[PDB]
Design a protein around this motif. Structure first.
Motif, PDB file in Angstrom:
ATOM      1  N   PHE A  34      75.883 -31.223 -43.115  1.00  0.00           N
ATOM      2  CA  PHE A  34      76.378 -32.386 -43.856  1.00  0.00           C
ATOM      3  C   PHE A  34      77.293 -33.177 -42.929  1.00  0.00           C
ATOM      4  O   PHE A  34      78.428 -32.766 -42.672  1.00  0.00           O
ATOM      5  CB  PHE A  34      77.110 -31.973 -45.127  1.00  0.00           C
ATOM      6  N   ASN A  35      76.797 -34.307 -42.423  1.00  0.00           N
ATOM      7  CA  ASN A  35      77.550 -35.157 -41.501  1.00  0.00           C
ATOM      8  C   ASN A  35      77.996 -34.372 -40.262  1.00  0.00           C
ATOM      9  O   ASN A  35      78.905 -34.782 -39.538  1.00  0.00           O
ATOM     10  CB  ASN A  35      78.736 -35.808 -42.230  1.00  0.00           C
TER      11      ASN A  35
ATOM     12  N   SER B 231      83.117 -33.631 -35.725  1.00  0.00           N
ATOM     13  CA  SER B 231      81.816 -34.087 -36.180  1.00  0.00           C
ATOM     14  C   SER B 231      81.153 -34.842 -35.045  1.00  0.00           C
ATOM     15  O   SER B 231      81.826 -35.382 -34.165  1.00  0.00           O
ATOM     16  CB  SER B 231      81.924 -34.976 -37.419  1.00  0.00           C
TER      17      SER B 231
HETATM   18  C1  LIG Z   1      80.228 -38.939 -41.536  1.00  0.00           C
HETATM   19  O1  LIG Z   1      81.135 -38.893 -40.417  1.00  0.00           O
HETATM   20  C2  LIG Z   1      82.137 -39.922 -40.428  1.00  0.00           C
HETATM   21  C3  LIG Z   1      82.955 -39.744 -39.170  1.00  0.00           C
HETATM   22  O2  LIG Z   1      83.413 -40.991 -38.666  1.00  0.00           O
HETATM   23  C4  LIG Z   1      82.977 -39.825 -41.698  1.00  0.00           C
HETATM   24  O3  LIG Z   1      83.898 -40.908 -41.730  1.00  0.00           O
HETATM   25  C5  LIG Z   1      82.082 -39.867 -42.929  1.00  0.00           C
HETATM   26  O4  LIG Z   1      82.861 -39.672 -44.103  1.00  0.00           O
HETATM   27  C6  LIG Z   1      81.011 -38.786 -42.835  1.00  0.00           C
HETATM   28  N1  LIG Z   1      80.124 -38.841 -43.986  1.00  0.00           N
HETATM   29  C7  LIG Z   1      80.475 -38.412 -45.202  1.00  0.00           C
HETATM   30  C8  LIG Z   1      79.435 -38.542 -46.270  1.00  0.00           C
HETATM   31  O5  LIG Z   1      81.586 -37.941 -45.429  1.00  0.00           O
END
Ligand SMILES: *[C@@H]1O[C@H](CO)[C@@H](O)[C@H](O)[C@H]1NC(C)=O
Ligand SMILES: *[C@@H]1O[C@H](CO)[C@@H](O)[C@H](O)[C@H]1NC(C)=O
Ligand SMILES: *[C@@H]1O[C@H](CO)[C@@H](O)[C@H](O)[C@H]1NC(C)=O
Lengths: 881, 92, 166, 100, 273, 133, 44, 191
Positions: free
Chosen positions: A313-314, A338
């Motif tokens: 997830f991300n 991430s």
């Molecule tokens: C995906 O990664 C980014 C990192 O910049 C984050 O801001 C975002 O919230 C992430 N996606 C979700 C669904 O949380």
């Protein structure tokens, strides 16, 4: 320029082995390289690249606290580096082996001696010198798969072996004898290996799991009969469906026994942390949502780093520490990071540990990346290193994008400019510049990673990952459109094969921002063979990029009505040529009103005395200025261009120097007629060729004088100009006349290319890549064949025109040269495992003390207005005498 | 000094035309020639030619005796480098 | 020998207009009442003098006046003596009248008389100051004489305006 | 006529050369601005020379033969030294504007 | 405004000594417009001086000479202006010495020896002036400003035979001016003699031809014609054609005075012969 | 020595109905090449000229002992049948390929009532590969 | 009636003694247009 | 067609013009500052003057009478009595400073033999000569301004003259002017 626009980046590749632990670490990668990266920022201290091919393949890295130890060439070599300046300390070679395993031992408390396992014998060398100490042999050595080794430091050294499904045999040796102490042999015909399954937990142990019965075969290897057993059923510890599980022990000191506690790997995402008592297991913890885990050890303490999906997830993975003896999670030391891409999985992890606690991590993610992570809350990535560029395939360079009432308009504009002058005194913020030299670069890579760079202080601006791509595949890169039809964006394309199914895929995108465009391509159903661009632009500016099936049918991506109409019109002025290197046969097909192909020509070669090597054709993006070479006596001598020509090169199958030869063929792609069919005897060497507007060049090797040579060809028709406006190749009977010559070159060679600059005015050069990394520029006019200036006696080497003075390049698999907007510079690029970029000045930059100008200006002006009033006065005083 | 001013004015208009043509060329290259600039330059050319004709100089006859139509004897007699002063001007 | 106001007036006016060079004049009346400034310059040249003689003779015969005197004035202030020219001039004038008067201004009035003798002397007021005042009134710039007539016909040798001025 | 001053001659020739060379330079510039090649600019130089000759003729008035014994130089004048100026100013302004 | 500088260069262009307007119009410029003139001043200090001297003033002379010494201290031309004022105030030997200096140290300085002749011309001794002048001419043969004055001198000595030589030389170097020709005629008629008189009439007409407006030579033509036509030494043909000449000249003079708008007196003179 | 066929084909649909126009005879021993043909009867000529109307192609084909090549009609019919054939081979002796070109040029248009075209005024010549220094 | 017939009476040189091809146009040539197109290569 | 920089235009074109102009002006002024006098004496002055006298007498001795002409001619030709009876450095520097450019273009086509002189620095050998170098600019402005400056600014001779005076006539040329004037009328209406 030497410090303004020329840069060098250098890489090492994708890791296999590595070792952490002052401010330096160590790696060893696929491309037979060693390196000593700085643990504070990406930078190198000593590359010691040895050999690209298999014969320099690494098999086991192992350090000693300040000294590295290495093994290359399938068990033969054993070096010993320094770990500080790469200064080798000793080196030896061993006897043939399969190198089953490697270790490190001591007498009672020391690290003097080291072990080896070649599947045939066993050795013990000294370390400081390298002079061998003792060697002996295995009992039977051909049927029991001696795959492993273990010490506990003091005294002795064991040695195991097992075939897949019959039984296990165990040995024990003692130093200074080489003698076989009692060798046990017990039956366990259910295991299929012991390499990645088992391991010694504490000081005489074997342990291996049987998913059948979900049990553990155990052995106090010092003294025990028939591998006493403990079932993994008392606890809820079910195995995986078809997962081969295993152990992960630890031994931070090879002389002191391994620690009791150990990890266990059940299923892709199931780990456990066991501990072994005298006869009874003591379980501490189990983790069902772990991707990767690692051990590490300080002076006395010992830890365990672990990765987890948070909520995959991300890609927001978390990292944590747990203590090995106990299991306790530590309140602090919880990193959350991430990635940038969508499908990208780590698949690796290493650890560095302080004694303050704290730590730092190293992560080698799937798509050829390296992250170095720190615990702080600010910038969490201390450095990110992109290793995918150690193998580049093809690339391109694209231009950046652009940003009485008449009398009143003029007045207004002039006023505006006045106001402006008086007032005067990243991806989204830039555009092309006058006499453009930015020329954004787009490179594609064999791991499936598309990039984008500025060509001046190369900075990655965007990236993209396309999955399901094999190591050995075939790419081709085509640029359709550049900054026109303003409501429409630029777009490039990419064709990929798979090399196993013949399947193909078409990925289309926008080179500037990195996004797949709105449209979809046609789905490639059949294996595609070749491609051409057909530079006729439809209503949307797009070149059609036709493709050829294996059923010899056509497919065009912008298959719109207008384009198909244009094709139904001008089909018969379009031809394909194909090649099959196995049996050596070429073919040539054409079009029809509808889209089919009817065979037009064919041509074979005996594949037992001639073997095609490569094929060359003129670049369609060229302009030729002069149609003639004016002789010294007011005589023209016209030249034959034949855009549709192409060259073929061959060599034999007999590799004896006595009758080894190279073959050349020149051909016309439309008809299939040979202009020239040549042969150069007593040569075998791998070739390197160039095919310009009207000249051709190739390099080779003379086995009767064992030295390198060139050979050059030029083509002239005569003094007349047959049909000097249309040049249809269906109508030229007059086959031109050939001039050639053979100079010599004193060294070896690597990739070669020719310069270019639109309108083809300036002198044309040849860029040569030596093995040492030296690049070399050579003027074409020196190689002219109209020379009596004899048959060249060692045509010179000049180490004063080397572009890369000390900015050397390692392997030089190829070169790229592209045009400017300024007509006196060409933009150069060299790949070869370390990139390079620069400019060239073939005609001395002929189209571009400052203060001294205005100084002399005003000096003159005032001397004038001072001499006037002197002349007047002297004349007047003449009058009065 | 009327004519000289006129000349300067026309010439400056021509130079302004040149400047306008330069900026027009730059703009069109960023993307053959208009009417207004042409009439302006020709205006300047002709109105400069007229003035430089009028101002260069004035023709002079080439028959000498026309010059001496009115040249009285008294002006031609008195030779300065043989002047002598003993006469009645003293007694004024 | 009685000389009229305007006679002496125009005499000295001429004497002052072209001082750097000698001049002569011709008097018509013995009560002299009018003078003629005719020449200014070398004066040693017959033809213009002769046509002047003839024209003035004819014009005064139309008006029945006679020629009554000559005068010459040198440029050398210390020279007040007759050369051949004045001798011949007054000789012919006396031939015509036999009572004519020759005059030489000292310029710093030396009237002569010839009776079978080389023009010896004769017995030597308000009009003096009159002429002086005129001279200091700066009016001699509009006095025309024979030479000016021969240059511009548009002049007039009667000089009526200066006559009426006094 | 029989008796010549031989100075006013030179004055008149000098003023002619002045006007001719200057207008030649001016034509070279006004052509080099709106660049035009070969036939057109030769037409231009010749038409401008003719204009000059006509203007000088106007200036004299009935040709005032006391000034000029023959109308030849009015047309021909100094015509070569103007060519060099003309091409030089083609060059200058073509360069400055229609190139860069 | 510029009128006055050009009208004070005119009087320098045609040797017109009229020296009351010179001073009156010059003193202003030399006093209070020095800047305006702009180094066209070192000649207005020499034209004014050499005429304000002849007016008699003698106060502006040194006002000029001192400045001239200031700018041009070492020279041989202003030495001339220092040797002129000397002879104005009856100092002749000082002048001769002042000239002799520059002459002895820089020959080819004609002006000096010219003024030396001017001194003798002043004193009265003419023979000596003539001798000195000719001795000069030998060295520097050709100076029209000399020849004309030499002929004027020969005249003033009442010798009408050698002057004509000087004029002939003078009318050989610029024969497009009526004045020299009519004066040659005036001196050769007054010389008397038949050949002389016919030469005189010829050059009379040749002069008149050029200007076609000179009156003196026209009257001379008439008088010479009448003289021949009442001279009993000529062929009847000469007499009659000269009578015709005189009649035609008479008619032309009648046209002249008609154009003008006395008449009767001149017509009586005409019909006299 | 050996023989080698020579098929010649031309139609309106640029298809293949390959038929014969005679053989080649090659002496290896010294090296010589010659031709032996038959002539074109009426229907062959009509076919050739109508194909020429559309600027179709004349195709020539022989086997590897295959290989082919082509040349237009427009450049041949108006040439009074002057073709030049070449047979390129390898160093040891092996057929490699064929090359056919007509003399001179093409498409000026002048037809000769097709009664010059009964002798195939051809020229044939082969080459081994030119060596180099 | 001649009333006024008046009779009055080393100058160096004065004595009264009554003595008695292809290449030119080559530079201007325009590159000819190509007609046929031929693309492909080495069978991916 | 060569897309060029404007810095080229300014700092390459203009200095050449300015420098050649002003250095020619300075050369003129210094030449005026150099000429000294060559006056030697009065003797050759007198000889020259009398020679000019003789020449004049030769050419316009047709406005004076016969006898005076003859007196002068005989005197000058009397036996034994006749007076005849007894860039580099500046070019180097400037080329040294601008060694290789392409300045501008001429709007009319030149053949190729004109090329080696207009460019004279450049090893291109492919350009139509219509594209010029910098040094040629200097050598050409030399001529243009050498044409605009004009806008903004012994016994042998004795004997030759004597012999040339031997063969000479009087040709009075004064024998009919009387009737010529008298012929038609007199002309004056402009007083
Ligand atoms: C995906 O990664 C980014 C990192 O910049 C984050 O801001 C975002 O919230 C992430 N996606 C979700 C669904 O949380
Ligand atoms: C070249 O081909 C064109 C095609 O139309 C033809 O018109 C021309 O005649 C050909 N050239 C010659 C020299 O025949
Ligand atoms: C045969 O070939 C020759 C080769 O020169 C050629 O000139 C001729 O036209 C061809 N045809 C005939 C019928 O000879």
């Amino acid at each position: 320029q030497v410090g303004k626009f020329d840069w060098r980046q250098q890489y090492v590749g994708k890791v296999k082995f590595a070792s952490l632990e002052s401010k330096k670490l160590v790696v060893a990668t696929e491309k037979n390289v060693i390196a000593a990266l700085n643990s504070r920022t990406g930078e190198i201290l000593w590359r010691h690249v040895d050999k690209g091919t298999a014969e320099g393949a690494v098999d086991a890295m192992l350090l000693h606290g300040q000294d590295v130890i290495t093994v290359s060439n399938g068990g033969r070599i054993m070096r010993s580096w320094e770990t500080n300046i790469g200064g080798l300390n000793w080196e030896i070679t061993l006897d043939s082996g399969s190198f089953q395993a490697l270790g490190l031992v001591g007498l009672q408390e020391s690290v003097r001696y080291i072990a080896v396992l070649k599947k045939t014998t066993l050795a013990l060398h000294h370390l400081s010198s390298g002079h061998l100490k003792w060697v002996e042999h295995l009992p039977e050595s051909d049927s029991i798969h001696y795959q492993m080794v273990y010490s506990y430091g003091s005294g002795v050294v064991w040695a195991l072996g097992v075939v897949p499904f019959s039984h296990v045999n165990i040995v024990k040796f003692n130093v200074e004898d080489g003698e076989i102490v009692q060798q046990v042999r017990v039956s366990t015909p259910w295991l299929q290996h012991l390499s990645g399954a088992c391991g010694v937990v504490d000081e005489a142990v074997l342990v291996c799991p049987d998913p059948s019965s979900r049990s553990l075969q155990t052995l106090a290897l010092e003294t025990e009969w028939e591998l006493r057993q403990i079932p993994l059923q008392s606890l809820d510890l079910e195995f995986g469906s078809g997962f081969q599980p295993r152990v992960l022990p630890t031994q931070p000191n090879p002389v002191d026994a391994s620690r009791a506690q150990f990890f266990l790997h059940l299923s892709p995402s199931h780990y456990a942390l066991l501990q072994y008592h005298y006869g009874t297991l003591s379980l501490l913890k189990n983790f069902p949502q772990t991707a990767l885990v690692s051990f590490a050890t300080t002076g006395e303490k010992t830890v365990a780093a672990v990765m987890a999906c948070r909520n995959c997830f991300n890609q927001t993975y978390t990292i944590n520490l747990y203590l090995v003896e106990t299991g306790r999670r530590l309140l602090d030391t919880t990193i959350t990071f991430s990635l940038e891409q969508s499908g990208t999985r780590p698949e690796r992890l290493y650890i560095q540990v302080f004694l303050k606690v704290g730590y730092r991590a190293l992560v080698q993610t799937e798509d050829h990346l390296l992250l170095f992570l720190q615990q702080l809350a600010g910038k969490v990535v201390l450095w990110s290193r992109e290793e995918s560029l150690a193998e580049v395939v093809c690339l391109e360079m694209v231009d950046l994008p652009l940003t009485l009432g008449m009398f009143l308009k003029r007045l207004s504009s002039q006023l505006i400019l006045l106001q402006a002058w008086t007032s005067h005194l990243n991806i989204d913020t830039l555009a092309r510049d006058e006499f453009n030299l930015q020329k954004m670069m787009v490179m594609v890579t064999a791991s499936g990673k598309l990039f984008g760079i500025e060509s001046s202080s190369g900075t990655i601006l965007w990236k993209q990952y396309l999955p399901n791509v094999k190591p050995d595949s075939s790419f081709k890169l085509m640029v359709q459109r550049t900054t026109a039809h303003f409501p429409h964006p630029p777009q490039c394309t990419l064709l990929v094969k798979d090399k196993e199914s013949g399947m193909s895929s078409l990925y289309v995108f926008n080179p500037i921002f990195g996004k797949w465009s709105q449209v979809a391509p046609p789905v490639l159903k059949r294996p595609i063979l070749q491609s051409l661009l057909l530079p006729v632009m439809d209503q949307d500016y797009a070149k059609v990029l036709l493709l050829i099936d294996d059923e010899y049918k056509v497919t065009a991506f912008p298959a719109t009505r207008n384009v198909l109409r244009q094709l139904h019109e001008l089909a018969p002025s379009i031809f394909f040529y194909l090649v099959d290197a196995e049996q050596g046969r070429l073919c040539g097909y054409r079009l029809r009103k509808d889209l089919t192909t009817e065979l037009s020509w064919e041509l074979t070669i005996p594949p037992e005395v001639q073997r095609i090597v490569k094929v060359k054709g003129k670049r369609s993006s060229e302009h030729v200025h002069s149609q003639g070479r004016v002789m010294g006596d007011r005589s023209v001598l016209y030249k034959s261009l034949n855009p549709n020509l192409l060259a073929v090169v061959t060599e034999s199958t007999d590799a004896h120097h006595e009758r080894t030869f190279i073959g050349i063929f020149l051909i016309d792609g439309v008809t299939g007629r040979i202009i020239h069919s040549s042969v150069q005897k007593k040569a075998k060497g791998p070739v390197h060729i160039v095919h310009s507007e009207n000249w051709v060049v190739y390099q080779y090797w003379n086995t009767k004088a064992r030295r390198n040579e060139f050979t050059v060809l030029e083509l002239y028709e005569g003094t007349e100009q047959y049909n000097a406006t249309a040049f249809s190749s269906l109508d030229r009977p007059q086959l031109p006349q050939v001039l050639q010559q053979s100079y010599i070159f004193p060294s070896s060679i690597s990739a070669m290319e020719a310069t270019i600059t639109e309108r083809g005015i300036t002198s044309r050069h040849l860029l040569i890549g030596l093995p040492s990394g030296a690049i070399l520029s050579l003027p074409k006019a020196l190689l002219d064949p109209r020379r009596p200036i004899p048959y060249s006696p060692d045509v010179q080497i000049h180490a004063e025109r080397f572009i890369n003075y000390n900015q050397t390049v390692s392997r030089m698999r190829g070169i790229y040269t592209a045009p400017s907007g300024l007509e006196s510079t060409c933009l150069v690029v060299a790949y070869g495992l370390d990139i390079y970029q620069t400019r060239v000045y073939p005609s001395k930059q002929f189209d571009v003390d400052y203060v001294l100008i205005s100084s002399v200006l005003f000096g003159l002006v005032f001397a004038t207005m001072i001499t006037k009033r002197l002349a007047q006065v002297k004349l007047l005083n003449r009058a009065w005498r | 000094s009327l004519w000289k001013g006129l000349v300067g004015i026309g010439l400056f208009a021509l130079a302004h035309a040149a400047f306008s043509a330069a900026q027009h060329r730059s703009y069109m290259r960023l993307t053959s020639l208009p009417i207004d600039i042409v009439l302006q330059t020709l205006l300047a050319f002709a109105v400069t030619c007229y003035g430089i004709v009028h101002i260069a100089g004035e023709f002079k006859d080439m028959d000498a005796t026309s010059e001496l139509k009115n040249k009285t004897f008294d002006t031609l007699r008195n030779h300065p480098s043989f002047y002598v002063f003993n006469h009645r001007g003293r007694v004024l | 020998v009685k000389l009229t106001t305007q006679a002496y007036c125009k005499m000295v006016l001429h004497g002052a207009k072209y001082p750097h060079c000698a001049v002569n004049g011709l008097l018509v009346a013995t009560l002299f009442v009018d003078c003629i400034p005719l020449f200014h310059g070398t004066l040693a040249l017959a033809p213009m003098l002769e046509v002047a003689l003839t024209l003035i003779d004819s014009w005064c015969k139309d008006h029945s006046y006679v020629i009554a005197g000559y005068y010459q004035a040198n440029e050398r202030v210390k020279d007040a003596s007759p050369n051949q020219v004045a001798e011949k001039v007054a000789s012919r004038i006396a031939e015509g009248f036999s009572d004519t008067a020759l005059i030489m201004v000292d310029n710093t009035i030396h009237v002569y008389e010839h009776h079978e003798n080389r023009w010896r002397c004769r017995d030597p007021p308000e009009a003096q100051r009159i002429s002086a005042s005129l001279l200091d009134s700066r009016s001699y710039e509009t006095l025309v004489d024979f030479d000016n007539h021969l240059d511009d016909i548009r002049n007039d040798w009667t000089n009526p305006e200066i006559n009426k001025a006094v | 006529p029989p008796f010549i001053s031989e100075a006013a001659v030179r004055g008149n020739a000098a003023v002619l050369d002045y006007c001719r060379t200057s207008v030649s330079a001016l034509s070279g510039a006004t052509a080099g601005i709106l660049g035009l090649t070969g036939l057109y600019g030769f037409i231009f130089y010749l038409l401008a020379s003719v204009l000059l000759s006509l203007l000088l003729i106007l200036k004299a008035g009935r040709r005032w033969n006391k000034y000029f014994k023959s109308r030849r130089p009015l047309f021909t004048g100094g015509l070569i030294g103007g060519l060099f100026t003309y091409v030089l100013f083609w060059t200058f302004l073509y360069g400055m504007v229609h190139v860069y | 405004w510029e009128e006055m500088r050009d009208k004070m260069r005119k009087w320098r262009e045609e040797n017109s000594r009229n020296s009351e307007q010179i001073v009156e119009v010059g003193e202003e410029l030399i006093n209070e417009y020095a800047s305006k003139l702009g180094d066209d001043i070192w000649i207005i200090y020499e034209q004014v001086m050499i005429a304000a001297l002849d007016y008699g003033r003698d106060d502006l002379a040194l006002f000029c000479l001192q400045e001239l010494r200031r700018q041009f201290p070492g020279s041989h031309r202003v030495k001339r202006l220092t040797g002129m004022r000397f002879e104005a105030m009856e100092r002749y030997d000082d002048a001769i010495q002042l000239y002799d200096r520059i002459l002895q140290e820089d020959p080819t300085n004609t002006a000096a020896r010219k003024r030396k002749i001017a001194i003798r011309k002043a004193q009265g001794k003419n023979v000596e002036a003539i001798r000195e002048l000719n001795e000069y001419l030998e060295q520097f043969v050709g100076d029209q400003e000399a020849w004309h004055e030499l002929a004027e001198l020969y005249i003033n000595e009442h010798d009408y035979a050698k002057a004509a030589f000087c004029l002939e030389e003078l009318m050989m170097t610029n024969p497009h001016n009526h004045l020299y020709c009519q004066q040659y005629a005036e001196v050769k008629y007054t010389q008397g003699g038949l050949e002389n008189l016919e030469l005189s009439r010829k050059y009379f007409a040749q002069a008149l031809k050029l200007n076609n407006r000179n009156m003196r030579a026209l009257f001379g033509l008439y008088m010479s014609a009448s003289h021949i036509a009442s001279n009993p030494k000529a062929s009847a043909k000469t007499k009659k054609d000269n009578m015709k000449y005189a009649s035609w000249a008479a008619s032309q003079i009648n046209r002249a005075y008609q154009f003008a708008g006395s008449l009767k007196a001149v017509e009586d003179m005409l019909e006299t012969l | 020595t050996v023989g080698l066929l020579l098929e010649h084909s031309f139609e309106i649909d640029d298809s293949a109905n390959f038929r014969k126009r005679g053989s080649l005879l090659w002496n290896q021993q010294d090296g010589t090449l010659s031709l032996s043909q038959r002539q074109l009867s009426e229907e062959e000529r009509g076919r050739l000229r109508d194909v020429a109307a559309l600027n179709g192609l004349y195709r020539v084909r022989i086997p590897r002992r295959y290989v082919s090549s082509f040349v237009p009609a427009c450049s041949l019919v108006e040439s009074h049948l002057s073709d030049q054939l070449t047979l390129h081979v390898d160093v040891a002796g092996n057929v490699v390929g064929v090359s056919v070109v007509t003399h001179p040029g093409g498409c000026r248009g002048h037809e000769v009532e097709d009664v010059d075209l009964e002798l195939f005024n051809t020229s044939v010549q082969l080459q081994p590969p030119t060596t180099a220094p | 009636r001649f009333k006024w017939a008046i009779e009055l009476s080393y100058p160096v040189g004065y004595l009264d003694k009554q003595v008695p091809h292809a290449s030119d146009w080559l530079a201007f040539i325009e590159p000819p247009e190509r007609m046929e197109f031929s693309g492909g290569g080495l069978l991916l | 067609e060569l897309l060029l920089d404007s810095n080229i235009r300014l700092w390459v074109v203009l200095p050449i013009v300015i420098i050649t102009f002003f250095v020619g002006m300075i050369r003129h002024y210094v030449s005026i500052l150099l000429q000294s006098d060559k006056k030697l004496t009065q003797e050759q002055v007198s000889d020259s003057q009398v020679l000019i006298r003789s020449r004049v007498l030769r050419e316009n001795g047709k406005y004076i009478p016969k006898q005076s002409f003859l007196t002068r001619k005989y005197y000058f030709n009397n036996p034994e009595d006749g007076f005849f009876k007894k860039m580099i450095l500046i070019g180097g520097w400037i080329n040294m400073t601008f060694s290789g450019f392409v300045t501008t273009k001429v709007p009319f086509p030149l053949t190729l033999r004109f090329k080696p002189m207009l460019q004279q620095g450049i090893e291109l050998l492919t350009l139509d000569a219509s594209w010029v170098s910098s040094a040629s600019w200097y050598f050409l402005n030399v001529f243009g301004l050498r044409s605009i400056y004009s806008l903004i600014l012994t016994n042998k001779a004795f004997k030759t003259e004597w012999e040339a005076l031997e063969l000479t006539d009087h040709q009075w040329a004064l024998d009919d002017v009387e009737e010529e004037l008298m012929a038609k009328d007199l002309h004056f209406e402009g007083m």
